[PDB]
Symmetry: D2
Subunit: 314 residues, 4 copies
């Protein structure tokens, strides 16, 4: 084959934004859009097409699951949101059944590329996507704590007047309320962030609120304009370029665990090296006492829910 083919599954606000971000960046020459309502996925290809007159060329079209036979990359944003009076366990059970109905026909098409999974809850569903496909663990890449890392970075940028790209600051654990900022491993210019904190008169106090503001930014953005999508759309575009450009770039992702942090048989938020084979390397960072306790607490929790969910899905 002559050029690179991404398949997006799920053309909601997250998925649409991803497709547009890949249109602006001129990444992937062919872009397949797969969802249930074919009239919408068509309208979206027609709308997204119009950008290719000012960006790089791209053949964007609406498709079905079979398009994956010759895909390099399947991006799964497929899932229903949290309806009021739906608990997290019902959201989990509803979304596992959605992801089973996406993975099985992708794998039946003879797709042998890389998965990036972005559907919430993302570390449960990255686990599920690997279980259901049979794919090697490194060829299922989780979006995981990429976005919330990006959020910690943008917040620490504004507080220090540093380009967000040079804040090496990681949100780690299960994407969601049990995640934490790995502040003791975090640096700007090689200099510890907890040293920058002490010279800038930024207390332990403020850093725990900065951390808690990252966890609540989804809520705060949903509560203002109804949804959140540009952040993750961009995080997804960035992991997409590490894979397709074979970069060996260092990104916080939902990465398969094989002993790192004392964890196994689990996807969870850590810095990883990302390339054409997916997760190349987990980077196992030094955790202080609080971070170590949040990673253990976050992981054990995530494991029970992801295994009962697969057991109940069957």
């Amino acid at each position: 084959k002559n050029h690179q083919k991404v398949v997006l599954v799920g053309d909601g606000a997250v998925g649409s934004s991803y497709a547009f971000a890949m249109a602006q960046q001129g990444i992937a020459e062919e872009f397949a859009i797969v969802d249930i309502i074919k009239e919408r996925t068509e309208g979206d290809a027609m709308d997204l097409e119009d950008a290719t007159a000012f960006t790089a060329p791209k053949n964007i079209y609406s498709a079905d699951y079979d398009t994956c036979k010759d895909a390099d990359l399947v991006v799964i944003t497929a899932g229903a949101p949290q309806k009021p009076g739906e608990t997290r366990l019902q959201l989990v059970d509803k979304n596992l059944k959605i992801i089973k109905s996406v993975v099985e026909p992708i794998v039946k098409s003879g797709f042998d590329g890389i998965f990036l999974v972005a559907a919430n809850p993302v570390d449960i569903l990255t686990y599920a996507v690997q279980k259901l496909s049979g794919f090697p663990k490194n060829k299922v890449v989780g979006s995981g704590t990429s976005l919330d890392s990006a959020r910690l970075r943008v917040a620490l940028g504004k507080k220090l007047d540093v380009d967000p790209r040079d804040v090496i600051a990681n949100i780690m654990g299960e994407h969601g309320d049990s995640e934490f900022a790995a502040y003791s491993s975090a640096t700007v210019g090689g200099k510890p962030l907890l040293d920058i904190a002490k010279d800038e008169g930024i207390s332990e106090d403020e850093l725990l609120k900065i951390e808690d503001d990252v966890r609540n930014k989804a809520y705060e953005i949903i509560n203002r304009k109804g949804a959140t999508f540009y952040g993750v759309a961009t995080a997804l575009m960035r992991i997409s370029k590490a894979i397709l450009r074979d970069e060996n770039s260092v990104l916080p992702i939902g990465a398969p665990m094989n002993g790192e942090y004392g964890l196994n048989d689990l996807y969870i938020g850590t810095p990883a090296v990302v390339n054409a084979s997916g997760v190349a390397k987990v980077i196992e960072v030094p955790l202080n006492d609080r971070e170590k306790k949040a990673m253990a607490d976050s992981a054990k929790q995530l494991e029970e829910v992801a295994k009962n969910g697969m057991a109940k899905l069957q």
Copy 2:
């Protein structure tokens, strides 16, 4: 001042997409969002911020009209859509009153940058923005037939298997039903498009439908997914870079007329040279008999509606 400041006015789907497209492209270091509902324009700055961790740095914030004092660029997407049982004349009268309420406070702030006007109907409202501001005509740039040119280009690309960027094909006239494709001036590689048409067995017949499909793509996209925004968002980003990078780039825009096509005292769709001063040069293209008749018909029509509208607005 040390860096470039864009102000978007109007943070609907068109405006939001524009802001994201400028975030991906790393164009403008400071990006002000002005609309009525401050909780939405805030939510959008918070959402758009998150991209700057993977793209170039950008200080995006919600503001009011006063932010324009030190703006290089004001992008006006402000306007209400066409409600069913609203005629075009009521849409015109409603949108003129909206644009008067945007222009007056921008000009009161002491803004002395460039306008790009994208609110529909765009050639009436580019006219209005120039009348209301008192600004020299070249410092009011219309979005005009940029999008629909982009659409003709993408359609002729697919039909010939040519990168849409190398189809030099212009939609001209008033953006809307009275516009036409300047096919006799259109070329690929220097070679006339009507010669490519005759070798490719593409009839006069097919080209008039290709033209009519460009005019109906808004409708067709609205009818599939409820709205159209990625095309114009990208067209707006592209004209935005010609201004801010002082490019002297050739783009189809709503350009001020001073004798070109036998027209005066009018903004209308033509290729123009775009730079840091706005419209540098109108490019007056050869029209065949049909194109000349569509440009005259489109322009006279647009003039009566734009002058009654300003007369009624007062």
Copy 3:
């Protein structure tokens, strides 16, 4: 391949070293092999060029031999000695034909199955030779041809009109060299005839024939100032290389295989052509007015006799 893309450069002179650096800046091709005779120089260059990768996109840059071509997507041939003072164009031709034979045989022996881009001068003779000697289909030998001088014409018409050179759609056509011409009648700015732009701007017939002549002399004029010319063609090579590796189907002026276009066949010559992952997708046959019809015929007949005598002599 496709998901980790490999360019091989053959010839790490000024043109080739500039090419590698332009491909370093643009972040195009994940792997970049340099093949030249003196390995201590091709190594020193890969060491200097990798220093860029800390600020540009990642790239595996290294000195190699001809065997590296087995898994290459794209082989860029800049190799050949330039014109010595008492050397005739015929001896430059005969010398560089024997050099390109000595590059092509080991490329083919490596099992290389990707695309050639030929930049060695004289470029339309040597693109002919690369095709005859490789056995590769005509579409997978792309000649740099009139890309650079097209770039020169566009930049000169851009300074004259204060237009972005990327929107000045003017081609230099024919054999790259003294016989080439500006296709001014087919040339356009936003779809406007350039001859009409010329008449409104007070640019006469004779100023355009000088602009055309000044393009053919720019190499000499630059060589006489700073000893050599390379940034132009380095860029043109990078641009054709991006159309191939990104499968763009972009319209570029190139040395394009002829099959009836301009009444020509069994020749590579300067025309706008659609370029993608398979090399030359589509030759654009542009309309020629009476002067440039006669310049294309004159340029092509000439280039044919020299390419056929040269290959007859080589073989």
Copy 4:
């Protein structure tokens, strides 16, 4: 200014010509003046570099004199003669101090009010001199300093770990040259200590001291192969130039004015620093372990005596 940005290059040697080409590829700065002694070469170069603009972003590239600096945002000084065989470092110092005096006086006389970026070797002595001789605040003289060798260290640690060199946060620090060191204790990959990466990867203390030494020798090793080194620093200059013109507040290793950081004052020296439209925004004072504390002190004391004797001699 801001909306049409002007860089002036002073010195169109190999380093400066590469810089201009990298700035051509990246589409940074709308106007680019080249100021050197031999005007026929600075013209030939502007003619060759403009040929790029047909495929890259538009740019007004031209040969100028020192007066062009009046409306410049950024003046890049690469100017100075390299080390002649029987020349001591003191005579190289004394020769290049008198050259930089002869560049700085007419820049200042033009009414130039933008930022200096100083790349001429020895770079931390000559950044000191550019500040003393210009009268400009310390923040508006940015030294290229340890940017290139930082780039070298990162590319070498990237090949060893198969990590994108852009994610290897390792700095070379001190005086650019033989006294400089790799700040390995403060160095990190995704927030992981590099010394921990070293111990898991079986990379010993002695291999890291060789990697450090191999960075200090890379210039020599490249010069011995291909006569000169330029693509590295050309790139480093382009990167610092983008942080200034885009007001990025990006963290880069540079020759940064000292005001108490490392117990140093009244010196330019290699440290990571935040760089924006006002030049040096913020020096990052990184933690030094016992070896690199003693390398920074040793490097800085040395550089101080030579910069003060040299300016005493010049003045």
